């Protein structure tokens, strides 16, 4: 009962802790009574975050559902999720909110230092090949086509964080990647499920210039056309190369029913893919921004939407770019972090 | 002693004798090549002792890069017949996929360009990169052509 009756999930933009109820086949929140920091740490560790704990507090219930996995005290030194049991309603009038890692905060054309602390550059043979996105001190998200077949040893890659100038990414100064994990479903032709995990050999030290980017929690309600941003080293000019500077471009999401139209991609886009162009063109991703982060701001937190997959003109819009859906893979990401622990 | 040197975009390396090194040298389990005449880091296609590479700042690169005869699959070490790291290798009549780039090589181990037909599938390869167009409408020869992300063309009449 470890692939069901022991699964916890944070929910919503407010980080509402939940526990699965096999008896009723549902996700339920947890009442705040009897709860302390220790059970918050246990719920974080179970979720693959290991020792990362940020804050837990009670928040007035807003989802509206009337049911709770109430905790026990006299059960003994047993599994934490051996205790959580159902109840009609607690008297504390508060549900638990649990943040396992501080993320999604940045300092307030080219991008200034500390504006995208979660951006990294990946160096195969001293040359910028793919970007990335920090999610924890020792895990970076990128694409599967970056690390496929010929290039798949962790000994080929190296990461640079907090440095803005490609000229300033010296040899022997990056972070060595100690493992490369590609999604098993990844299909080299359709590039479906194009996401890879690249575990660094040493943890990243977080400061004003280096910081994580939060993962998409379930139930985010992305509006039809958000206002995202795209970052990475590329070339705004076509027929270009890896830009000397890190840039950033406002991009607008595109509905999958429009991006799969026959003027755009005629069903090329699968459920695990996301489009984000910009009307009037003049802005999109580009080479060297493949494997880079697409992020948005909702409820005061920078969220990770996806990572770059492919395009057909790259600032020649009416053929916009495509990114993988981080939300869909988040459970596999959690599993991979959990097993490695 | 025992560190690199960047000077006006030139790259050098000095050994324990404070003398710039030339030729093959294994630094941190990587091989660089420096010009015998000037000692600068190597750059561009450079045939050496029957083994062809494509250097950038003295470090052989992986992938497809144009040479005197055309493009070649410069591949990692021990990819084919105990080839050195980045050495050009024989790659005939089969596709190459690399960082999402789909190359096709002919019988001579050179990447084809322009229109091609392989196993009944019509392709196009950018002349300046040999990268096979793929994944959306492309403007080629002043027309419109749609290629699936495998790179295969879509007729569309």
Author numbering:
A (entry chain B): 142 to 249, 260 to 492
B (entry chain A): 2460 to 2616
Provide excerpts from the study.
Similar to other LCTs, TcsH comprises four structural domains: an N-terminal glucosyltransferase domain (GTD), a cysteine protease domain (CPD), a combined transmembrane delivery and receptor-binding domain (DRBD), and a C-terminal combined repetitive oligopeptides (CROPs) domain. TMPRSS2 is a type II transmembrane protein that contains an extracellular domain consisting of a low-density lipoprotein receptor class A (LDLRA) domain, a scavenger receptor cysteine-rich (SRCR) domain, and a serine protease domain (SPD).
To acquire accurate information regarding the TcsH-TMPRSS2 binding interface, we managed to recruit smaller CROPs fragments for the cryo-EM study. MBP-fused TcsH2236-2618 was selected as a substitutive TcsH fragment to form a complex with TMPRSS2ECD for the cryo-EM study. L2558 from SR27 and F2605/I2608 from SR29, together with V280 from LA, L302 from LB, L419 from L3, and W461 from L2 contribute to extensive hydrophobic interactions. In addition, the backbone amino groups of G2559 from SR27 and F2596 from SR29 form two hydrogen bonds with E299 from LB and S463 from L2 of TMPRSS2, respectively. The proteolytic activity of TMPRSS2 was achieved by the catalytic triad composed of S441-H296-D34543. Based on the structure of TcsH-TMPRSS2ECD complex, the TcsH CROP unit-VI largely covered the flattop surface of TMPRSS2SPD, with the β-hairpin of SR27 and the loop of SR29 stretching into the catalytic pocket.
